[PDB]
Design a protein around this ligand. Structure first.
Ligand SMILES: [Cl-]
Ligand SMILES: [Cl-]
Ligand SMILES: [Cl-]
Lengths: 260, 247, 260, 241, 260, 241
């Protein structure tokens, strides 16, 4: 059963008009443009007992992603692939599940992580990558921060020596078979305006938002519409245009944080 | 090395045709009937090719635990569910992560159409059951729901019509097979309130260039517009059959 | 924990008396006699991706049953038996469990389906028959419709070729080892009257109902009393008499639908 | 390799004749912190029942405007059987909980306590067949111990068919290997049947014969229940109907 | 999520003062001293189909503990140990879990039960001891009764012959490898007084209680503070002193019940 | 095979003496959308705590007429240990939640906010023993950060016994292989014990010695908490009691 959340904090018309009035001048409460991202922090290896981890601060949103690698028999429905299991927790479900799956899809479909290179003994043993993503501070646009946290954690992930049957956790053999990073860009429809990386207030007044996932060459790798409202054809057209030219900047910044 | 032809099957074949003999711009056969459940407030069966869904609406009613109700709106309670015998291998009846997400996605889609403000402190129940899955079930479910709501006489901005548009062998195609979903480069379910040109559901799994995205998007509209007219007709006659044809 | 249903639709005394007044003349709202069944529709192979299936319309009650066959290792305690798993879902639990078990019991105890003939390699591999029954429209006397849907689905069930280890789902080898159909007849006690196949209104005013399951040679194969009220000794005596002579008619009709 | 269930002196695996009840032991007011309580024993089937009396209900939307809600729990302790039962409620335990609740709803005058809940918790300490009935009777008696107004007490027995032979009050052996198992429960003074189930197979004639035998058994049990009500403690050694 | 119990039966100041006034004279409602235990009954083998069992009456608190033995493959992270699984049920959770774990801890850390002597085939097969503890009557100080019921149940436990693969449940080979009984003594802080074995009323007015577990040679084997309130350093100091000299009496009485 | 814990030299596996605390790091107001927040670190044990301040309670029947309800969650992230922990709450996690809640209930002046809920969410980011305490302290400090009135701050340490030797503030190494593990927490200014547990084994004497050593450790931690309150950030390198 999926039902309309009864907890929503319905945000008065007067405050909404305030924000719209600013959009009309092409500026937001925090002072950024309609197409700007919030400030981005990435701290790698924040969670020491994780195989790889990342703390992401995007505005007031905080997400800690952490990886854990384990040896498993491959699933008999995918004999020459390792496993990726993505999991999201909100702390301040259903939204958690959506987030996990959207992030998953964008990592899997893009082949950003190559599962076929996680095979150890074909049909006998493969690597399972548990990716656990913890939303510590809900500041709006959680999805984009989750993607960034997940990608960063993966890139931070150390792979260990394999005693062949056993893992040796003090000899670091290498890293994950990663092809490229990926970014997800969310564009919110508010009134007649499109706004990139909506904050908490912006999310509560939006009609809907749409998230685009991109690879570095700028191929679209996932799309997810979100929210109780609708969006026009041309809104979506412009949103992806906007999303794409934002993706370039965000990818560059991500790479600086990762050490490319 | 040289004998090793690939493993994925071709999806665009002789002439310009697909595994089921359709052209890239052709819908599957459509069947719609309304008021099929006597004890529901509204109901509908929807069929796109081999995808069958049934939807029941239990109309605006005071809500069981009141703290869960809303002071200004009706709460929508939506269930997307697949019967264990809808697929080839038996699906577990327990709700899957996929089923939970699609429940939400479909709910939000309906929330944008249904005039919930009209019924404060009430719940509208929408139960969907996929009887046969052949891809595009999330859309067939949403449309069946939309139509069951109209059958219940619940005021809405517009009806909802949808199709999965996709990419097969570099070719942009309309309304996907099981096979096309399972081996295609892209799968993009899109749903609208067609008269308003308002998009209600929008998802893409897979991969596309912006150009391909825009082309696919155009094709979905033409398909949606055809489906929409059939919905409209189903509303008057309670029963509609449509054999496959080109956009 | 089992508790008195708080949603329970309490039906005014005035309307109850209306219905009783009719029973006194030996007739019901829909115009049938106290011992009549509602009109019966059966559509076979309604759910195409099922191994066998049936859509049952009994009055306004709709039930879709579907079977699915899979190869399993047998239970260590039941080494020379296939498996039957019955499952019921109400869509408009506990009642769902009761229904599933009552139906199960009547199919199993009667040996209508012979589990010992579902063995493939003894101790190694057997057929599991998953029977999933979906109540789509609640029009009263759901149990009787469930039995009908279940029996019909079983009779509609195709068995596939066994590559010996693997199933071949485009060569139909035969059908289920079924001895006979079974019917369940429900008799409701309303005031001082007994009524066969109670509808929705009838069920809400009844003291209690009692369901009898019969084989074609009219052996009793299950009994289940239902409802928050009680019933006298002689009520039950008459009820079974009534149920039995009803069973004959219903079995005949069932057979016509099944092609005997 | 099944067991012969009737030997050729006409007696059952435990030495009983087809018309003999197991030994019965009943005691009331055994739990200090409950509003009413009872322990009931039929042969090696032991159940304890606690009633937590009429009381305002926790979440009010779940209460009824004209009646008390009955909350019934049928539960088997993990050490009640030979192999350890999982404490998690089984499909069987869920169904019996409902069946027992309905049985009690037909006896208890719930209208007298609107907006209240009556809690009935049952625990099987030893299962030797007929536990659903022992549970129900214990419940019935615990309710009387709490002074909750009822139409009548409830008395029950499983009647069955062994080797073509109609028998009264079954063993686990008899339950396991018999052709039929028919638990029946009544409010004996009113001749009102409260619980009625059959698993297995019977001809209408056999059904009617078994039905008659259950009544005689029920009538004996009923007198013991009545006596347990006055003296708080009753022992009854096995004997013929 | 753990939250303050809303059902709590808040006991009026007037009644609390009543009880405190009595403590000031060094006596309680039931007439015992501040350091006295309530009357103790132990009935062994109460649950016949259990491998070992005990019914404990401590004041108005009743606990029935029962054991069940089963053959299992040993856990990977414990290859030369049998298994102990303790489980507690309150019938009149979280408190149930706490109780189970506290009891478990005291049995396990003490080596009152020796798990290493429950190995049958090393690495292949071991005994699993399921200990199920049922609180039938809540009369306060449930933990101490649980320990006593658990200990007694273990001591009452019969072990069966092992057909080597199969168990033979009518040949009793011996008993559990038990080193010694253990007792837990609870001391409640009420106002400025310390009270042993608090009853129902006492528990509802206490600041907090602290439970000490002892072996016969008076080694401390577990400590658990309980309750919404706090306790001073010296309170705890005195509590353990009191608990220990109480332990001696209780162990003696326990042994009499067990037949030493 | 099984580690030695006191080397000839009298030092522990991490080079500490028996009377030395691990390094401590504390910071406050780290979460923007919480009413109060704190990160606490003892050696390699990291915990983050968020408080969502006094607020009317969702379902009212669950609220209290005279007090606030404390809702406490103790949780370990899956990547806090060496082997991945299952995110689903363990029996351990459920118990510790309760133990921590009771600990806080003795400190927080809940009477001040009737009909309200105070939410306290704890997350262990890295477990290296003593996580239940680090959690509790982070909670305590997050409450202070939210300006929630309390009797005192809470400070704690696990004291224990290694190789016959009483030691202060345990490793996972020492926890797993030691004879005793005794987490103790207080409101230090009031000398009131808030949390008190022992797993393992001790003579009363050893118990008393260990208890004294915990107090000195607690007193050092307490001063750091006090300082963290003023400056929002405190680092403390390891040293002797
Ligand atoms: Cl789909
Ligand atoms: Cl039974
Ligand atoms: Cl810890």
């Amino acid at each position: 059963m999926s039902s309309t959340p009864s907890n929503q904090n319905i945000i008065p018309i007067i405050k909404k008009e305030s924000i719209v009035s600013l959009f009309e001048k092409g500026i937001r409460q925090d002072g950024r443009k309609l197409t700007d991202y919030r400030p981005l922090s990435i701290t790698l290896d924040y969670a020491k007992k994780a195989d790889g981890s990342a703390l992401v601060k995007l505005g007031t949103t905080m997400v800690l992603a952490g990886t854990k690698l384990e040896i498993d028999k491959p699933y008999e429905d995918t004999p020459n692939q390792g496993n990726l299991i993505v999991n999201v927790e909100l702390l301040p479900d259903e939204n958690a599940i959506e987030l996990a799956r959207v992030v998953d899809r964008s990592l899997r479909d893009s082949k950003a992580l190559d599962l076929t290179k996680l095979v150890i003994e074909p049909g006998k043993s493969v690597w399972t990558v548990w990716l656990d993503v913890y939303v510590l501070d809900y500041g709006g646009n959680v999805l984009d921060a989750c993607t960034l946290a997940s990608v960063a954690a993966l890139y931070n992930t150390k792979v260990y020596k394999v005693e062949q049957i056993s893992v040796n956790k003090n000899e670091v053999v290498g890293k994950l078979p990663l092809n490229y990073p990926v970014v997800t860009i969310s564009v919110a429809k508010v009134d007649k305006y499109l706004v990139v990386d909506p904050d908490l207030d912006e999310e509560s007044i939006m009609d809907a938002k749409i998230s685009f996932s991109y690879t570095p060459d700028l191929k679209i790798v996932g799309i997810q519409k979100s929210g109780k409202g609708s969006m026009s054809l041309q809104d979506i057209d412009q949103a992806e245009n906007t999303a794409r030219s934002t993706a370039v900047k965000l990818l560059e910044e991500l790479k600086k944080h990762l050490g490319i | 090395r040289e004998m090793l032809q690939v493993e994925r099957p071709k999806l665009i074949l002789d002439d310009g045709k697909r595994t089921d003999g359709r052209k890239p711009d052709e819908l599957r056969s459509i069947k719609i009937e309304l008021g099929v459940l006597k004890n529901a407030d509204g109901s509908a069966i929807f069929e796109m090719g081999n995808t069958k869904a049934i939807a029941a609406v239990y109309g605006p009613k005071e809500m069981h635990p009141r703290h869960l109700s809303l002071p200004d709106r009706a709460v929508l309670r939506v269930r997307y569910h697949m019967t264990p015998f809808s697929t080839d291998e038996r699906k577990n009846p327990a709700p899957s992560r996929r089923e939970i997400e699609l429940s939400k996605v479909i709910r939000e889609a309906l929330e944008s159409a249904v005039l919930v403000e009209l019924f404060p402190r009430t719940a509208i129940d929408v139960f969907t059951e996929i009887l046969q899955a052949d891809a595009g079930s999330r859309l067939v479910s949403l449309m069946a729901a939309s139509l069951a709501l109209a059958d219940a006489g619940i005021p809405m901005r517009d009806l909802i019509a949808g199709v999965a548009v996709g990419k097969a062998d570099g070719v942009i195609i309309l309304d996907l097979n099981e096979t096309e979903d399972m081996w295609g480069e892209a799968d993009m379910p899109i749903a609208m309130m067609p008269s308003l040109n308002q998009v209600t559901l929008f998802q893409l799994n897979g991969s596309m260039t912006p150009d391909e995205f825009r082309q696919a998007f155009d094709l979905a509209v033409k398909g949606i517009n055809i489906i929409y007219n059939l919905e409209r007709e189903a509303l008057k006659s309670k029963y509609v059959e449509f054999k496959e044809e080109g956009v």
